[PDB]
């Protein structure tokens, strides 16, 4: 068995090269010429070393006896030195190429993360089968036929637009072939990926880690007290959420808030989640979104989805998920997005 599976590094290199070709064609061409030059340069150096060794191994008597051997040795050494000189020159030009291409690494990382999320999407439904060519078509759509790059020339703004449109188009095309109930889940993951690509935001590893699982925190009979105004399930949710440093004084904060009960019976509490987490520095709006998500999961699980949507709206924009509410505009998709070789599978519920 010889399995050709997509690795994260290989896909990252592919996407980095593709965005370099699209955005900086001169830099990409120079890079290609440089790798070809260094490949043949290392080839030549290896041949020269082998030839020098074999010339020493195939000479009889003494080296000085035959001047032809001496001339060949001198020529080989001269060529080796000058090819090496070209090697350092190519190395510095690669340093220039590398410092140019350093700017597009986060986009390639996001590309690899999005593709591997799409591959993992098959775990939640058998219908969610996606090839690498599908994600590459999405990436090509974002890079070459993006209407938002029509008049923009600054490389930084083009890269930002490309990064935004990558997430948007990926969600649109994947969710058109997903059950609506799963859409938010995909959006959630995309947000988390876009959450990792922000330099100024923290990791939120513990908050997401308690967001998932969570029920694994075993509570004894004495561990969970009886809080007035909350049910047993709500009380255990408060106890589990209190494991965080930010929610350590959660029971006291809830008890000290007499209006909290009103918020517990509001139609849309996710819109007015009260400030119940203790933190020394003010949380970012996305951090506030995760704190409200934790509070809602603890207190109003029936509205969790709504809060999750708000979380997406905080990370990816208000209109990120708005296309799914619109009817399927099949004309444009068939005319432009679907290749003749690609069948249009239309899978319907009963």
């Amino acid at each position: 068995f010889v399995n050709f599976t997509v690795t994260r590094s290989s896909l990252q290199s592919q996407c980095l090269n593709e965005v370099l070709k699209a955005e900086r064609p001169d830099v990409d061409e120079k890079r290609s010429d440089l790798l070809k030059l260094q490949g043949e340069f290392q080839l030549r150096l290896r041949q020269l070393e082998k030839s020098l060794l074999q010339a020493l191994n195939e000479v009889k008597g003494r080296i000085l006896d035959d001047d032809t051997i001496i001339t060949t040795l001198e020529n080989l050494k001269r060529e080796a030195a000058e090819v090496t000189r070209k090697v350092e020159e190519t190395d510095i030009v690669m340093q220039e190429v590398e410092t140019v291409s350093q700017q597009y690494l986060p986009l390639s990382t996001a590309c690899s993360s999005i593709y591997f999320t799409m591959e993992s999407l098959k775990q939640i439904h058998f219908l969610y089968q996606y090839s690498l060519q599908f994600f590459l078509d999405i990436y090509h759509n974002v890079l070459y036929e993006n209407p938002n790059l029509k008049g923009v020339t600054d490389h930084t703004q083009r890269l930002s637009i490309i990064t935004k449109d990558l997430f948007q188009v990926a969600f649109n095309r994947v969710a058109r072939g997903m059950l609506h109930q799963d859409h938010i889940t995909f959006a959630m993951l995309l947000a988390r990926i876009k959450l990792k690509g922000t330099v100024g935001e923290p990791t939120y590893d513990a908050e997401f880690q308690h967001f998932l699982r969570g029920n694994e925190i075993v509570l004894s009979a004495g561990s969970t007290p009886r809080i007035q105004g909350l049910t047993v399930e709500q009380a255990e949710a408060v106890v589990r959420l209190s494991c965080l440093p930010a929610f350590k004084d959660l029971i006291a904060k809830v008890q000290a808030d007499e209006q909290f009960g009103i918020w517990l019976d509001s139609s849309s509490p996710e819109q007015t989640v009260p400030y119940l987490w203790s933190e020394e520095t003010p949380a970012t709006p996305i951090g506030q979104a995760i704190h409200r998500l934790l509070l809602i999961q603890a207190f109003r699980p029936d509205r969790l989805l709504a809060m999750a949507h708000m979380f997406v709206s905080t990370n990816l924009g208000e209109s990120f998920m708005s296309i799914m509410e619109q009817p399927l505009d099949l004309t444009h998709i068939v005319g432009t997005e679907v290749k003749p070789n690609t069948p249009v599978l239309m899978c319907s519920v009963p």
């Binding site: 010889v2 399995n3 690795t7 590094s9 290989s10 490949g39 003494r62 080296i63 040795l73 050494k77």
Partner: protein
């Protein structure tokens, strides 16, 4: 375990696995119950081979319990493992002796040239130009004994990777190789942790030609190419993107490879031709495998 151990012993008889300076570890990673209490170096080698074979069953179990897709581990995998071990050991030993012979002859010729110039300007300039080569050759000749010592373990690990790691992805390949390396460490088997697998089992010329044949610049792809080059059993390629197909066709254009499929009407004829004229053949759609290839 008895059968695997005895097969390893009989098949590695031609192997030069004798290390009189080998030290038995206090905690021997024993997988063979009737392994001698003071094991020899060859006994440790074959015991580690058996451990490598059982590690694949453990890995298949681990992927099975997680819902992953596993392929059956068979004694033919063990036979491929030992065959590759013998072949790679012999190849590396031969290459290293040849390299040392050339280096020694070059060094003695340089020394003779120095004696000749002592007993003029052009040859002194040549010797000044050859000083770096002489230093590098002496250093490489010094590393000869360490390379000799690590040959056995390096070849064992490389053969295990060639035989067993093809179906699995990058993470599982790394896990299996790390497990085998750790077991060799517990068995006091010498191997190198610095050289990469692809660099060890392929040269730069082959990698450059593979890049010419449109093999993607990836470590896993290079490992796949090495497997496609050194295979004992005929390879089965899994590539949804299909670039492996073009890589094979590009690598075998000069030898007139023919593309066919199990579902094609002419396949049998094509196969017959490929068998009679000795030409490379590429058969697609192995999910519809025709058992006529069984012999």
């Amino acid at each position: 375990t008895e059968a695997l151990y005895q097969v390893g012993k009989e098949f590695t008889s031609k192997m030069d696995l004798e290390k009189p300076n080998y030290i038995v570890p206090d905690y021997m990673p024993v997988v063979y119950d009737k392994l001698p209490q003071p094991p020899s170096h060859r006994e440790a080698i074959v015991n580690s081979c058996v451990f490598v074979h059982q590690t694949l069953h453990q890995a298949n179990a681990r992927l099975a319990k997680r819902g992953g897709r596993t392929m059956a581990i068979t004694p033919r995998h063990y036979l491929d493992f030992i065959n590759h071990y013998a072949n790679l050991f012999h190849e590396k030993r031969s290459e290293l002796e040849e390299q040392q012979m050339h280096l020694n002859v070059g060094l003695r010729k340089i020394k003779e040239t120095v004696d000749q110039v002592e007993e003029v300007n052009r040859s002194t300039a040549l010797l000044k130009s050859l000083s770096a080569e002489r230093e590098r050759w002496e250093k490489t000749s010094e590393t000869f004994k360490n390379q000799m010592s690590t040959i056995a373990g390096d070849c064992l690990l490389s053969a295990a990777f060639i035989a067993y790691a093809g179906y699995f992805d990058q993470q599982m390949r790394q896990n299996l190789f790390t497990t085998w390396s750790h077991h060799l460490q517990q068995a006091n088997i010498q191997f190198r942790t610095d050289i990469a697998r692809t660099e060890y089992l392929s040269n730069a010329d082959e990698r450059l030609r593979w890049q010419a044949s449109s093999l993607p610049a990836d470590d896993l792809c290079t490992e796949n190419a090495i497997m496609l080059k050194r295979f004992n059993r005929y390879p089965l390629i899994i590539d949804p993107s299909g670039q492996a197909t073009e890589f094979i066709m590009n690598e075998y254009k000069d030898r007139k490879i023919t593309r066919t499929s199990f579902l094609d009407d002419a396949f049998r004829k094509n196969l017959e031709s490929a068998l009679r004229f000795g030409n490379p053949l590429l058969v697609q759609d192995v999910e519809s495998y025709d058992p006529v290839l069984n012999p």
